[PDB]
Symmetry: C5
Subunit: 311 residues, 5 copies
Amino acid sequence: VSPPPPIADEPLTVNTGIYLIECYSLDDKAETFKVNAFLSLSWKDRRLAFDPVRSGVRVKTYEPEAIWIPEIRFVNVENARDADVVDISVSPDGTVQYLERFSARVLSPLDFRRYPFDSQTLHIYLIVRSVDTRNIVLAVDLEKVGKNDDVFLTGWDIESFTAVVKPANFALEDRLESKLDYQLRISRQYFSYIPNIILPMLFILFISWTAFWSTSYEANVTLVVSTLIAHIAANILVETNLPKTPYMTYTGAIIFMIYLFYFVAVIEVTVQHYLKVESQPARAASITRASRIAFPVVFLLANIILAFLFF
Amino acid sequence: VSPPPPIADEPLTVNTGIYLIECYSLDDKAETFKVNAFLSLSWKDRRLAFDPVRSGVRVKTYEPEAIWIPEIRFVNVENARDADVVDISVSPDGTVQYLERFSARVLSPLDFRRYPFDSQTLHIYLIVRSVDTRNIVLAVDLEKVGKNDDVFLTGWDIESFTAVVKPANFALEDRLESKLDYQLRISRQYFSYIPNIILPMLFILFISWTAFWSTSYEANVTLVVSTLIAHIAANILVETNLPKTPYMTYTGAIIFMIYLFYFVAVIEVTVQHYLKVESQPARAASITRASRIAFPVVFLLANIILAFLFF
Amino acid sequence: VSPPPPIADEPLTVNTGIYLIECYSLDDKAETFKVNAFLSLSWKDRRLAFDPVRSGVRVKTYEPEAIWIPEIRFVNVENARDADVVDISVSPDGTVQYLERFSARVLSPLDFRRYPFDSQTLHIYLIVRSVDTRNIVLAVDLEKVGKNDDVFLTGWDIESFTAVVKPANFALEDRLESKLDYQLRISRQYFSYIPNIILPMLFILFISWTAFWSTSYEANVTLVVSTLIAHIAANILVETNLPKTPYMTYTGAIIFMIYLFYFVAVIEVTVQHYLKVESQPARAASITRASRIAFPVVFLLANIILAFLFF
Amino acid sequence: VSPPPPIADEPLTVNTGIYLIECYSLDDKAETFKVNAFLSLSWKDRRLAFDPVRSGVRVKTYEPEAIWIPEIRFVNVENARDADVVDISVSPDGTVQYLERFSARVLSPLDFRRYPFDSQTLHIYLIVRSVDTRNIVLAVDLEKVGKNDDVFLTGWDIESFTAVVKPANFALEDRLESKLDYQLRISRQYFSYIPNIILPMLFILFISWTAFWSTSYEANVTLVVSTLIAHIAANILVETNLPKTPYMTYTGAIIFMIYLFYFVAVIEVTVQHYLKVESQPARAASITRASRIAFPVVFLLANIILAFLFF
Amino acid sequence: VSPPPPIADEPLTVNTGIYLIECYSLDDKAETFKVNAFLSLSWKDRRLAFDPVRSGVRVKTYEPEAIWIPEIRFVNVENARDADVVDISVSPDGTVQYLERFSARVLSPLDFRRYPFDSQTLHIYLIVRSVDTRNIVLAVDLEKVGKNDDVFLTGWDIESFTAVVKPANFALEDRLESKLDYQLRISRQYFSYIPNIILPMLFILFISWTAFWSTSYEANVTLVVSTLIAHIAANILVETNLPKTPYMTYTGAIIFMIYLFYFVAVIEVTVQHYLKVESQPARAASITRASRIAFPVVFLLANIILAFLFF
Ligand SMILES: CC(C)c1cccc(C(C)C)c1O
Ligand SMILES: CC(C)c1cccc(C(C)C)c1O
Ligand SMILES: [Cl-]
Ligand SMILES: [Cl-]
Ligand SMILES: [Cl-]
Ligand SMILES: [Cl-]
Ligand SMILES: [Cl-]
Ligand code: NA
Ligand code: NA
Ligand code: NA
Ligand code: NA
Ligand code: NA
Ligand code: NA
């Protein structure tokens, strides 16, 4: 129970492969996702080699404790994976074919810049630490890298699950470390966001703009202020389903922009009333009539500007 | 231990059976449900066979570690099942009768299209991976497939728990995989939804329609706007108890439709007031009188259209 | 390590007893409760018998692995109990006295029909599966069935903890199953509900009825509508602390009834205003004066009707 | 591996000691707190005695499985403690000095009568069950009872951690049980409650009292009703951070009292308006002028009465 | 399996090192953070010495149970760390090089005085208890102390991860304890707080100040009261994401100060109206005109005073 000895002075290549069985619980706020998959490992151990003609069997099955197995770990995991060894098969040349079924909560940062029209690249980093006898290098066996067709992630479209074939070999605490990158590309299902958040938020804003077709300050105050309270409720609802980003998000920009539109509408409503009391409604009517065109035009213009800056 | 050797070149049939003891925690947002059940397994191992006459005993009881047991796993589970082996009995012909009691959180997608008048088909997928010595095929023993009469799922009616007798045999990572489908059919108890969400949401909408029997713009603004705020509160309450679907739900359609009715009511209230100020209330009175009939008629019409499209 | 052999052809009686140490976490929505208790088990194993005179000792102490112990399980538990064996004592006749301390989350449905003036019967079902050698039957040893005096359940009064002495013996998967019923009777502490939810909800309803002593439609709309928003807030607060029941609850009935009172008050307020505008306030004043008596009388009458139907 | 034999007919005294390392997660609603501490145990086992001269060593170190250790449990815990044995030392006379580091979620009821100006006495109950060979009695070794200086409980001031030196010896299931009481005295940090809940709640109430300096019923309705909605929001916020008590709390009393003040203010506002419409404002002005003095005086008076009844 | 014997009378130096792999879940309310890191331990055990010539290997690999490993614990952890031993290597002199990968929830108090423009010093305390044979002293091996470049903490900037090289050696329960301090310095990413909470909270306050450009008491009441309700919503949203501190926070001060500004605005609105009714609007106009300048000036002044007191 030690690493296999090298024939010359070559590092031990451990061929890896992750096959996704179940994908679930993508927490946007925590930037984590739960995964249930197969982990396949393959290496050459010449000490386990046998003659197939004399043995009578073409493959030998071993228990994990009986043979040497590379200590393969995941970098971006909360806790160590819950694994159950499925099978260990040894071919006559000494090539081990290890398979285990694992479940782990993976930590992968998300880019909310384009939310809810955003795409993500979820990562799963495989790692091996080189032993004192010899160095261990990871490899990708594309034949054993894939996903089940049933694999569904609620509110997401699963594009592809590939692996960066070239490992990131580096020094860590005076020992070699071979790191592999498994990438799960996903795109957000933005459909629900339109009738649930986008359109209701636009309607309450358009309702506040009816104050531009009214001279009643008491009714105008009620219109602009109440709809602002509805927008504050909408802002709270959205910001709780998202983490605190050091960058501006597309939704964050719009929500903040809408706050300015309510503030400027309050100013207009205040100015309109002040001029009516000061016995000059001709100045107020012209401002109110201008606002009827200005508010939707500037809103459409600014939205085009924002959409261009983000997409 | 190792798999039992085949007499000819036949695959090993492992007869299965799931008997539900407890069903609980159906998370709609997570599309998961917790289950506590019996898992019965039966296979022929000729190496364990004995003569009942000289043994003196008709059945031999073994501990799990003593004999070979097929590695039976669940496909759609978050983590590996928590199992406690109940009994292992061996008949004289070598037929093993294994029984275990398990508990597992099962991942099964739900169809919210008809919510809260929806029915679901919960799945439990049993799976076995074929070994190098011989292939393992799963079978359904209908005698050991059932459920306890006490089995209750909060807010759901349990119809039936059956199994698709024919297994889905397929190739996975260069090995045969035998997959069985256990189906738990349930229907939602929609009763509570009527006095808690449906009727209160209709009442607040009918209260907004009283603005069609009033000329006071200040009172009308207060009526339509405040009731809209109540509907926004109701929308938030409903959408949090449901996951983000790429398709339209029945409740989602109604909620969204009601938003249009509030918006058009605001427009009516705005138009009515604008005409009263412009000294033409005959035009306003006729629009307001038409709305008294139009709003309930178009609402009833659209609801019939929606109910037909969904049911 | 097999069951004790029968002297004749009698089943093995395993005397049980549950002594509650701690009762906590009664989740109304989940219909679950956490329990920490002692589980006492007693059976006759003649193979363990000894002469007290020759042995010099009255009782022999064994480790769980050394002797045969019946596989006692709980039916209505989420996961298998966390148990620590306290003591195993054997008397000279071969009678084993087993004791363990366990902790388990128990699933017991609750009847919310009379909430918050409801009483519950929490269940703990003990079960044993008969082995092939002989049948195992459960029994109640009332001496070892009880509870600690400190045992407290937050917001509940603990009446009694008894056991149904006669077991439910039945056939399951071609084997005998002996099931015992341990009942924990509790009654809800309804005190808090009066100053926190009942009285504040009645006050906001009485505030809406002040519109019957006002002719100002603008003020009346504000009165009835705002108080309705407060009642919607109260409805949301209550319904979240309760699960979705297929039956009507006492609180559910009142909340729904109060919604009708707000709707009819809106109708009255609308009718009153319509008649004032139509230049016939004598008709409006008489309706408004009638409502001053009708609303509290019909409310008190309907509450008496509801209380009678539920209690 | 059995209890040490008595020299005469004396019970075995097991000297205990708890040294708090970390105190955290005091859940007020659940009435639980998490603790990380050292558990020291000391007893005399003459079978383990040795001559220091012949042995060459003054102290013998044993592994838990090698020697007999008393089964010490905690009464008021959710689940059995997570313990790691630190050290087991045996002096030449046979005195064992056991030490372990544990972590456990402790259930201790809290008295919310004086909340948020309340003090609590958290309990940790140590217990031992007497074996058949001899009786086990617990003792307090004050030298090994203490706490770390860094020990902090968020929003609480830690006064003292002492132990009731005299154990509660009692009979349970025909066996002796020795119970010890470890008391952790804490007092609530009420500072935050003043600018966050107390003062904002008083301000909204004083804002409602401005209706006593106004004749506008429409403005008065808006004043008293809106501020009541703010108080309902405050009531919901407070009651969620507290469990449902069968007794009245200090905060509960104030919140409920404030509801009466809003109701009486609505009555005043209603009466004032009714008299203005009935063409008798001299009666209304006198009532309104009286209320300007009555409301703050009766509020201050009732608060003094309440503070006296609770403190 | 006992500590290594000293050559003279020197304490055993155990060289430590923590290398952060993943940093996540910084709960502000709980004052906890989750960490996934490498724990390296190195000590001299002369009993494990070997001749590389005779053994055939330059470095001997052992399993944890085979050799003596110092009982290294963390002080400020909720529960004992979840560790997986990576490697144990022994050089021919007997120097052990232990490595494990751990995951633990660390308890570290935070200073919210400057929130959300605050910086924190997270602590990780390593500790060893001296055995009876010899004393164990901890040391820092700066070569094995570091962090991964990918290490990200959501909403935080990771400055440095260093260790206090000099251990805190002290007496505890009559035994020596060597304590090391690993410090993770972080600074809050305050960006999000500006468009999400700061600016929307300032806008609603400026909207309330429009009442200084209006004589309509009914509109003014609606303005100041509704915006106060929005500020109460904002206060609740902020205070839930923060724990109850016995000290004043920067955000806590501003929120509380804003409450005074709303109260004084209500007083102004009340005074203005009272004077208009008392037929003296010249006194009211002058107060209202003064408030137009006073409110923004005093607000800016007080904010400068607060920012100076906190920064
Ligand atoms: C406290 C709560 C559960 C409750 C009980 C009884 C009556 C009501 C209202 C509807 C008056 C109520 O909300
Ligand atoms: C974002 C939040 C924590 C906060 C920080 C700083 C200042 C304010 C006020 C001025 C809005 C504030 O609420
Ligand atoms: Cl891992
Ligand atoms: Cl499984
Ligand atoms: Cl169980
Ligand atoms: Cl314990
Ligand atoms: Cl630890
Ligand atoms: Na191995
Ligand atoms: Na086996
Ligand atoms: Na046993
Ligand atoms: Na022992
Ligand atoms: Na060791
Ligand atoms: Na109003």
